[PDB]
Amino acid sequence: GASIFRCRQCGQTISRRDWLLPMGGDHEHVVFNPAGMIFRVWCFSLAQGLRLIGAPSGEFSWFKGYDWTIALCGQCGSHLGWHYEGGSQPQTFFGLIKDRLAEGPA
């Protein structure tokens, strides 16, 4: 019905509703970057079709204990969110910008 998440700009397969991850009790986190941009972030245990840019950085990380790398759509290059690593339980996860994805059938 609506179990697959694709890149909104090009349709690249990214994630699934089954792979949503409740972090802090909720898979949705609203955050701001240092430029004041608001993001409605959904946390996923797993994702595909991305391209992770650069090396991890902990600066300004919204999630305690985690370092982030920019995650672009591997197909069109749109900024879809961030990959997080270096933490504990889980050690890694994806934070994806909800409004840059499109939900649909398998």
Ligand X SMILES: COc1ccc([C@H]2CCC(=O)NC2=O)cc1
Q: What character string, x for contact with Zn ion (CB under 5 A) and - otherwise, covers 66-95?
A: -------x-xx-x-----------------
Binder of ligand X out of 62, 72, 75, 87 (CB under 6 A): 62
Nearer to Zn ion, 66 or 81 (CB): 81
Amino acid identity, position 76? C
Pattern of binders to ligand X over 66-95, x per CB under 6 A?
--x-------------x-------------
User: In whole angstroms, how large is the CA radius of gyration of the chain?
Assistant: 13
Nearest-angstrom CA–CA distance, 13 and 23: 23
Nearest one of 59, 12, 61, 18 to 41, comparing CA atoms: 61
